[PDB]
């Protein structure tokens, strides 16, 4: 609602704990063979296209 | 058949400016203050000539790499005598390389057209005018509302914006500086007697149609700078009235006694301005700082953020969801992106500036952790966020999927080499993966 | 939810002490009808910013006019 | 000629120009280059106005081809043709700061396959430039479109 | 008919909305392999001599 | 005459100015007579340009010629 | 069996002059006053001297590459101690190339 970006940055970064990580953050950090190894079934489940 | 005008040594020069832990913050404030108008920069030509001269002779590096408009200003005029001749060449090679990549993309674009419109819009995201560059000082938004066929909805806070006819009721134009001579007091009284919180109004100067359309600014912000810095830059918010209270409440500014041409550091009273000048190691004359004080009338009140949301082309539009037919983006209004600050610099600089995370190239944990204590304690208490891909930015500002530049772009740019072949690779990744773009690829 | 930024440290009450200038009688017009004294000094500071910037812009406009012909014909003889 | 320092008989020949030059095209034109010629040099340039020719023109020379290549059904196909620019010069791309100064005195003519260039002719005319901005695929020199 | 060249330039470049491209201006764009490919049969039809 | 490039920015009043040129009385031969104001003023400015260019070429002609042997022979004593 | 008289550096110089954004436009006025007449170049030589000299000093680039007549006149008429040798060698080698 409000225009002020100062409080936008502050209230998101005021008090934080263990922080979420997205899917493609981990889809871009693995090498080829470790990705294609069948121990990351999550990532191979969600890269169909 | 592109041949790179630019050279490797100038890219190492830009890289050395990118990792400068002694970057002069006063020049950075001046950069924030002109904000890309021709007349405002002809207000302040001899100051920035002194600035570039002293920073180029004192160490083998140059400032003002950051903002594109200051680059185009320095390339366009002044030059010649005031700055050193070798320091002009870096800027010339940057601007020439930015020109040459455009004809490279145009040759990769087809000569043939679908209908009236050209097909380079479908081939390259850079050539595509639906995309918007991050820093906006000219009124790109109304122009994009005119030229874009597919519905370019603009979000300002709560309020949508989709009609050109709404341009008075949602946008306040900034008048030209000579014309606003009657309305200076009405511009100023809005600060005291108007609330800028939940304003929903955007104060913007006039757009300029001059040349090169939009390709050059896009290739400069999205190709050259993320490569040359390893993408270590963040968005900046500026509190302009505090900057005016620094410069204008100065002792020589009141002074009938103190002359036009003297060293301000001889006769300053102790303050944040003196400390900024000494850490920035540059003695300015009084008339320069009085010009920078005079520029406050026309410059805007505060920084803002804007969501741009454009429907896809007809090649890739097919989706079961209406919300997934449309691709979303951010534009920073009256703010500027940022190299890393020094730790000593953030003691007086914090009263002027604040951090903004932005899209993947311009959202960085180390620079934003430099600007705030909260971001610093966050990144310290959680070091895994130190990489660009993991770092969590607000939903109020940022979303990874609904964008043009995703995470692997930034991951490529972080470990990117300063070679110009990497410039070519960064350019080559911008192909839209469209069916007719595959014809364009099959040609070459 | 309005916490923008604090003031950068500067000299208190400089314009009351140091100058005697054309800015002083226009400064005499300013009044404190409602506001507290610290907020009054803040708005006073912004108003002094406004006045000094007015004056510097006018001096620049005076500089922009340049050099006439007939004056040079008079003195350079 | 109309400058004033070149006008006045009182002012000395050898002296620099910019100590007395007034706001106008000479101030901007020299301020772009930061060139200080002496006043008598500008006087000698002003002396050129006697045999200074009139406006530039375009003249088309149409000749028959070679006699080895003479064979054709059409006699008009035999001629090959070329347009020579009379009293005009060829030039590089202008700056945009210098455009507002040079616009008073100079105008583009794209007339030859090597000399018909979009980035150079785009600076000189706003019409050519806006035409380029509307469809950017014109930026090729081989596809660039010139008057009949 | 008229001698002045500035009128000839401005009248041609003032209000034009479209850009026609000639034959050989398209032939010089293509590489050899696509030129011999039978997708382009309009241009290839007129390279007899 | 159909389309001309716009007139270059120049300072005016070079005719009625303080410096006095010997060409000026011959310039008094031209009169408005038929013409409107602005047309005649710019036409007579062009005519003064032609006069000053003629004067410059004449002075250059007199300048280039050289120095006689007889004057340098007198320059002994 | 030709041997070239111009090396790659002077071609780089001329290419740089081509791609100059801040090419001094006042030179064109000079060219407009010259317009390919011998006698008027002999009249106006102490101005083209200063023009070539100052643009050679401000950048490594050189001036007056536009028309053949100007380069022909600079190769012919200068021949003096005054104009810098390094600038003169460029025009000399270009005319030697055409020869």
Q: What is this structure, in a nutshell?
A:
This is part of a larger assembly, with five copies of chain A and two copies of chain C (77 residues). With 49 residues, chain A is mainly alpha-helical.
Could you explain how this protein is built, in words?
This is part of a larger assembly, with five copies of chain A and two copies of chain C (77 residues). Chain A has 49 residues and is an all-alpha fold. Chain A is built from four helices and no strands. Chain A has helices at 5-13, 23-27, 32-36, 41-45. The radius of gyration of chain A is 17 Å and the shape is elongated. Chain C has four helices and no strands. Chain C has helices at 14-17, 23-27, 37-64, 69-75. Chains in contact: A-B, A-C, B-C, B-D, B-E, B-G, C-D, C-F, D-E, D-F, D-G, E-F. The interface between B and C is medium-sized, with 37 and 30 residues. Chains C, F: It comes from Epstein-Barr virus (strain B95-8) (HHV-4). Chains C, F: It is found in: Virion; Host nucleus.
Which secondary-structure class do the elements of chain C indicate?
mainly alpha
Tertiary shape of chain A? elongated
Number of strands of chain A: 0
Q: Report the sheet-strand fraction of chain A.
A: under 5%
The oligomerization state is: part of a larger assembly
How does the overall form of chain C come out from the CA principal axes?
A: elongated
Question: What is the overall number of helices of chain A?
Answer: 4
What is the element string of chain A, with H for helices and E for strands?
A: HHHH
DSSP helix fraction of chain A: 40-55%
What is the makeup of the main sheet of chain C? none
Number of strands of chain C: 0
Subcellular location (chains C, F): Virion; Host nucleus
Subunit structure (chains C, F): Interacts with the major capsid protein/MCP.
Protein name (chains C, F): Small capsomere-interacting protein
Family (chains C, F): Belongs to the herpesviridae small capsomere-interacting protein family.
């Amino acid at each position: 609602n409000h225009m002020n970006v100062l409080v936008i940055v502050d209230e998101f970064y005021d008090n934080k704990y263990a922080a979420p990580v997205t899917d493609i953050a981990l889809k871009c950090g693995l090498p080829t063979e470790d990705f294609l190894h069948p121990s990351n079934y999550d990532l191979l489940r969600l890269e169909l296209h | 058949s592109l041949a790179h005008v630019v050279d490797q040594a100038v890219i190492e020069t830009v890289q050395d400016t990118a990792y400068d832990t002694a970057y002069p913050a006063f020049f950075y404030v001046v950069e924030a203050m002109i904000h890309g108008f021709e007349e405002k920069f002809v207000m302040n030509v001899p100051l920035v000539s002194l600035c570039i001269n002293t920073y180029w002779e004192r160490s083998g590096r140059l400032a003002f790499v950051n903002s594109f408009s200051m680059i185009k200003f320095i390339c366009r005029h002044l030059g010649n005598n005031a700055i050193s001749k070798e320091a002009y060449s870096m800027y010339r090679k940057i601007y020439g390389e930015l020109i040459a990549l455009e004809q490279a993309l145009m040759r990769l674009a087809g000569s043939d057209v679908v209908g009236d419109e050209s097909v380079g819009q479908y081939v390259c995201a850079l050539l595509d005018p639906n995309l918007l560059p991050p820093v906006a000082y000219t009124d790109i938004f109304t122009h994009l509302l005119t030229v874009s066929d597919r519905a370019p909805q603009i979000i300002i806070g709560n309020e949508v914006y989709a009609d050109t006819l709404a341009a008075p009721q949602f946008i306040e134009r900034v008048g030209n500086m000579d014309e606003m001579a009657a309305q200076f007091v009405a511009l100023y009284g809005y600060r005291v007697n108007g609330d800028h919180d939940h304003d929903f109004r955007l104060h913007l100067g006039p757009y300029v149609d001059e040349g090169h359309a939009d390709v050059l600014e896009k290739i400069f912000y999205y190709v050259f700078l993320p490569t040359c810095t390893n993408a270590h830059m963040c968005g900046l918010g500026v509190d302009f009235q505090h900057v005016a209270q620094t410069l204008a409440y100065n002792g020589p500014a009141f002074s009938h006694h103190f002359t036009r041409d003297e060293d301000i550091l001889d006769n300053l009273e102790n303050g944040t301005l003196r400390d900024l000048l000494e850490i920035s190691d540059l003695r300015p004359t009084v008339g320069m700082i009085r010009d920078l004080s005079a520029s406050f009338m026309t410059c805007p009140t505060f920084t803002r953020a804007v969501r741009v949301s454009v429907d896809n082309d007809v090649t890739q539009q097919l989706a079961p969801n209406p919300a997934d037919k449309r691709t979303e983006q951010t534009v920073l209004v009256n703010g500027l992106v940022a190299f890393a600050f020094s730790e000593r610099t953030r003691a007086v600089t914090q009263c002027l500036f604040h951090a903004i995370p932005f899209h993947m190239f311009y959202g960085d944990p180390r620079v934003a952790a430099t600007m705030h204590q909260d971001v610093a304690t966050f990144v310290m208490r959680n070091p895994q966020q130190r990489a660009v891909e993991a770092f969590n930015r607000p939903e109020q500002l940022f979303a990874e999927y609904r964008e043009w530049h995703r995470s692997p772009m930034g991951k490529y740019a972080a470990e990117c080499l300063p070679s110009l072949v990497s410039i070519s690779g960064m350019t080559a990744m911008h192909i839209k993966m469209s069916p007719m773009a595959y014809i364009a690829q099959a040609k070459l | 939810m309005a916490r923008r930024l604090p003031k950068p440290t500067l000299q208190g009450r400089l314009e009351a002490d140091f100058p005697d200038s054309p800015l002083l009688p226009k400064f005499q017009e300013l009044n404190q009808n409602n506001l507290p004294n610290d907020v009054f000094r803040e708005a006073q500071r912004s108003y002094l910013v406004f006045l000094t910037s007015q004056f510097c812009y006018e001096e620049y406009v005076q500089r922009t006019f340049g050099v006439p012909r007939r004056q040079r014909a008079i003195d350079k003889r």
